[PDB]
Amino acid sequence: DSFWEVGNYKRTVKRIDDGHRLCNDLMSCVQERAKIEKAYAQQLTDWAKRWRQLIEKGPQYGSLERAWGAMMTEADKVSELHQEVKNSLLNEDLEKVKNWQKDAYHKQIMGGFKETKEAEDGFRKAQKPWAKKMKELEAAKKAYHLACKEERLAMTREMNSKTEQSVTPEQQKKLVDKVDKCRQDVQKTQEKYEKVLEDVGKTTPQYMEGMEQVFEQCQQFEEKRLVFLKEVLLDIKRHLNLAENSSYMHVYRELEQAIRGADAQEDLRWFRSTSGPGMPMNWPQFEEWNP
């Protein structure tokens, strides 16, 4: 069941096709993230844009309003970073895979891919001599095994020529003298087995070094993918990471900074002076008749 069997080079071709196939799988992967990433962004914009109105239409006044309104914009700034992740994840990352797939592989309108077909042919052609000789070997194997079986079990009928009687050769026509040619039939057939056996062994190197050729070419092509794939996964990581740009870490410094900007005393004192006992007042005193 090895690579060195009559036909099992197919998996190295299934690979090349699967090569182009993964490229597809991955692009879909980065896609289905972008959607999920963008899904958070839009809802952080929902909750931000929405609770900005609610807070900025009473009844929270003064500082602690701004302290609370700091949250609205943190959601916005974060929602921005995920929107960047998305715009990075699709416009840069995916269009690399898409572009490499296009450049590495080449479509054949009649057929799968030139890179799958060509490699497949090379293997097949190097296995052309072995293909035929393994068929000859098997015919020669049967030819000798079946012609041989006879001699062994058909001299059990030759020995019978002495059991009952069969004295004169009148009754022993080829009762015994079938095993003359039958044995030579076994021996002349064994020679073609041995002969085709040798031819196999002599041309094994040619079958081997020829299959290694097409295979080593498949490793070049496979490597060149794995190389590229390692890289793009690494690129996707950078892009997925919001700890890379301090811009993330900056946001939650502003939130705390703004939230410390609270000063309940000032808020209290404002409401006194604008809406309470601080408010000036025209104390009644005197009015005259005019007009």
Cβ proximity to a copy of itself, 176 vs 242, nearer residue: 242
The CB-of-116 to a copy of itself minimum distance in angstroms stands at 13
Residue 49 interacts with a copy of itself (CB under 8 A)?
no
Q: Which of 240, 211, 14 lies closest to 123 in space, CA to CA?
A: 211
State in angstroms the smallest separation of the CB of 192 from a copy of itself: 14
User: Please, which residues have CB within 8 angstroms of residue 169's CB and are 6 or more apart in sequence?
Assistant: 177
What minimum distance in Å lies between the beta carbon of 124 and a copy of itself?
16
Spatial distance between the Cα atoms of 242 and 238, rounded to a whole number of angstroms: 8
Closer CB to a copy of itself, residue 49 or residue 173?
Answer: 49
Residues 240-279 that bind a copy of itself (CB under 8 A): 240-241, 243-244, 248-249, 252, 255-256, 259-260, 262, 264-265, 267-268, 271-272, 275-279
Q: How far is the CB of 212 from a copy of itself (least distance, A)?
A: 6
| Candidates 95-103, 108-116, 164-172, 218-226; binding stretch for a copy of itself (CB under 8 A) | 218-226
Measured CA to CA, the distance from residue 100 to residue 251 in angstroms comes to 37
Whether cis (ω within 30° of 0) applies to the bond prior to 205 is: no
Three-state DSSP class for residue 243: coil
Q: Which is nearer to a copy of itself, 165 or 285 (CB)?
A: 285
Identify whether 129 is preceded by a cis peptide bond (ω within 30 of 0). Answer: no
> Which C-beta is closer to a copy of itself: that of 33 or that of 94?
33
- Binding of residue 57 to a copy of itself (CB under 8 A): no
| Interface with a copy of itself, residue 159, by CB under 8 A | no
Identify which range of 3-11, 102-110, 161-169, 174-182 contacts a copy of itself by CB under 8 A. 3-11
Q: Establish if 107 lies at the interface with a copy of itself (CB under 8 A).
A: no
The partner residues of 93 in beta bridges, in order of sequence, read none
Give the C-alpha separation, 94 to 92, whole Å.
6
Helices (H), the chain: 10-55, 62-88, 95-104, 114-126, 128-154, 179-202, 204-240, 246-260, 264-275
| Residue (168 or 260) nearer to a copy of itself, CB | 260
